[PDB]
Nucleic acid binder design. Structure first.
Lengths: 92, 92
DNA sequence: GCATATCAATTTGTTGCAT
DNA sequence: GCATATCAATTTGTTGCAT
């Protein structure tokens, strides 16, 4: 399922137009990105939570030259699945 | 940031009412879960992608008894962060 | 979140293309 | 995605409890 196919179902479920369903979904996804980036954890009950996970430098290897290198420290987006999400994917 | 706080920001950005922002967001998240559960991968450009992943059985240990046990195989919700998410969290 | 086990199995990214 | 390293810093879950 891509964004467009999701919008169709959302516009159907929420009884709104596809242009509206997209505009809201766009806003929702952009806001989650902004919030996480600003170091804020985004929690959505049932579904899950988003946060930034810190990551220190690690050793790596150049596949073309076999030469060892250091992959620099960085910040990554993370996701934790809520109870309802994990239970729909794997019922107790 | 919780759902309610996300709704407010979404309703502000998309120029819609809070009830409408919530109705869409609920539908969007509930659809995402049903799709992942039925074995479909949900891809959203910029943001990221959701999918199920199967974990094989592994050896574990009971902290209450010290007794070694086997954690059974399962399926879990997973997330891949898209380029735009990873770049707002850590700009190149 | 917190905790056992001298745990055990994930996930990713490394460069530079390619689909 | 593919092409290394007998990679390497990382997540996550055992059974429950604490907040």
């Amino acid at each position: 399922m891509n964004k467009g196919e999701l919008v169709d179902a959302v516009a159907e479920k929420a009884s709104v137009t596809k242009k509206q369903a997209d505009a809201v979904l766009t806003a929702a996804l952009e806001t989650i990105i902004e919030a996480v980036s600003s170091g804020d954890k985004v929690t959505l009950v049932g579904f899950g939570s988003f946060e930034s996970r810190e990551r220190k430098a690690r050793e790596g290897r150049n596949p073309k030259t076999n030469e060892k290198m250091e992959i620099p420290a960085t910040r990554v987006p993370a996701f934790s699945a809520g109870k309802l999400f994990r239970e729909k994917v794997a019922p107790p």
